Curated annotation (Swiss-Prot), chain A:
This is DNA-directed RNA polymerase subunit beta'. The lineage of its organism: Bacteria, Thermotogati, Deinococcota, Deinococci, Thermales. DNA-dependent RNA polymerase catalyzes the transcription of DNA into RNA using the four ribonucleoside triphosphates as substrates. Belongs to the RNA polymerase beta' chain family. The RNAP catalytic core consists of 2 alpha, 1 beta, 1 beta' and 1 omega subunit. When a sigma factor is associated with the core the holoenzyme is formed, which can initiate transcription. The gene is rpoC. Signal peptide: none annotated. Transmembrane segments: none annotated.
Length: 98, 345
């Protein structure tokens, strides 16, 4: 599990920067975000944002370091329902018994 | 082995493994702590459950099992069943409110995390309020309680970080503690600063006279309403008690308590007193008319110390009548057979 990210290139990261560049969270423009070859999940511009901020106006920010904290634990993305013992872990996406 | 070192190492080791970064980590946790609140509240909102209950159930699931609820707080929340019921409703909260549940826990967590990381801060602070009359460990602990207090009010929206904020909320906690527990006989915070000022003043007064100020200077230098009676009084309370048990005389084997006498206890002399006194008073009390003798016997010797309110239905004229005529017949025959004259007192 990695944490914060600066501005080399933005791809595949969580919802943080989503609202910053209004293109993808305002409308479906993250595809057009990829600049010039699209004429010839996350994928942002070539490299435009460099802060751990909220972009109303660059106000709620925090320019810093990006951690890479390796958690030695087993990550499950799509657990399923088996009722022998009480439903363990999780369902596809709806139910979360954990 | 020896206590200070172990705790110091104890939290210094954990801070050593987890100090909070200046901005990021404090911001992170803070943000989570607040969302926890906002969450717990909205949780109370859709459950109708008291924010106090939503706060104790998320605490139980994150900080400890039935064990921590049963011993600390006696027993009103059923160790298993009760808290679980609550957790169930939290699960029922669909996608929308379930989110708050998941948030509350993680926030509670951050709270704890933020609290761990900033334990060096306490110790560093508490380090300076050492020789006030409190144990270093006690001091750090109160101060620690102070940091937990700061965690509840910090607003991350207001950009300033937890450092400067904790300082105050801790320094407050410590000073209070110093004023509340340091002495054997409790003294309110005002008396405390009062005494500090008194002390500081005596210091400035020691500066030039070469004469440990008579309580005149102290009154003057102190200010507005300071007088001799006030200062002699204050320094009298300033002196801590003495050890009823202290090494006495030549320090060999002398414990300060065999020498103080005892007052309530009737030394034989007094037990003999009450015997004759009560037997003789009891003889007199009987040979008299009950009407006004018992009235004044009981009103004076049975409850509390009211001529009018002393006699039942018969007004004052019969009171004074029999009171003064029976009291004198009683004293003048007692004058004859002198038994009472030798003042039992």
């Amino acid at each position: 599990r990695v944490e914060y990210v600066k501005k080399e290139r933005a791809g595949l990261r969580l919802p943080l920067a989503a609202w910053v560049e209004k293109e993808a969270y305002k409308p479906g423009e993250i595809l057009a975000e990829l600049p010039e070859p699209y004429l010839f999940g996350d994928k942002i511009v070539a490299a435009i944002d460099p802060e751990e901020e909220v972009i109303a106006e660059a106000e709620g920010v925090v320019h810093l370091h990006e951690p890479a904290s390796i958690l030695v634990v087993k990550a499950r993305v799509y657990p399923f329902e088996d009722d022998v013992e009480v439903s363990t872990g999780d369902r596809v996406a709806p139910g979360d018994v954990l | 082995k020896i206590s200070t070192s172990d705790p110091v190492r104890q939290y210094l080791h954990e801070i050593g493994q987890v100090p909070l970064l200046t901005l990021e980590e404090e911001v992170e946790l803070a943000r989570k702590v607040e969302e926890g609140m906002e969450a717990i509240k909205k949780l109370s909102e859709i459950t109708g459950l008291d924010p106090d209950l939503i706060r104790e159930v998320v605490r139980a699931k994150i900080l400890g099992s039935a064990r921590v609820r049963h011993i600390p707080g006696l027993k009103e929340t059923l160790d298993p069943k009760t808290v679980e019921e609550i957790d169930q409703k939290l699960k029922s909260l669909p996608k929308e409110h379930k989110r708050y549940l998941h948030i509350a826990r993680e926030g509670e967590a951050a709270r704890q995390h933020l609290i761990e990381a900033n334990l060096r801060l306490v110790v560093s602070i508490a380090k300076k309020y050492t020789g006030r009359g409190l144990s270093f460990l006690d001091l750090i602990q109160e101060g620690n309680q102070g940091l937990i207090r700061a965690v509840e009010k910090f607003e991350y929206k207001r950009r300033f970080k937890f450092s400067t904020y904790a300082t105050w909320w801790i320094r407050q906690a410590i000073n209070r503690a110093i004023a509340d527990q340091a002495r054997t006989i409790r003294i309110p915070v005002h008396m405390v600063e009062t005494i500090n000022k008194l002390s500081r003043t005596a210091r400035q007064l020691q500066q030039e006279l070469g004469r440990e100020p008579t309580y005149e200077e102290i009154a003057e230098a102190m200010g507005p309403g300071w007088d001799a009676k006030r200062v002699e009084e204050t320094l009298k309370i300033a002196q801590e008690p003495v050890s009823l048990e202290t090494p006495i005389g030549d320090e060999k084997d002398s414990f300060y308590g065999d020498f103080i006498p005892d007052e309530h206890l009737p030394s034989p002399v007094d037990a003999a007193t009450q015997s004759l006194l009560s037997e003789e008073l009891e003889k007199a009390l009987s040979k008299l008319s009950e009407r006004e003798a018992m009235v004044l016997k009981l009103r004076k010797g049975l409850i509390d110390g009211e001529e009018v309110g002393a006699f039942f239905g018969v007004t004052r004229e019969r009171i004074r009548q029999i009171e003064n005529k029976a009291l004198r017949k009683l004293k003048y025959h007692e004058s004859r057979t002198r038994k009472l004259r030798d003042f039992l007192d």
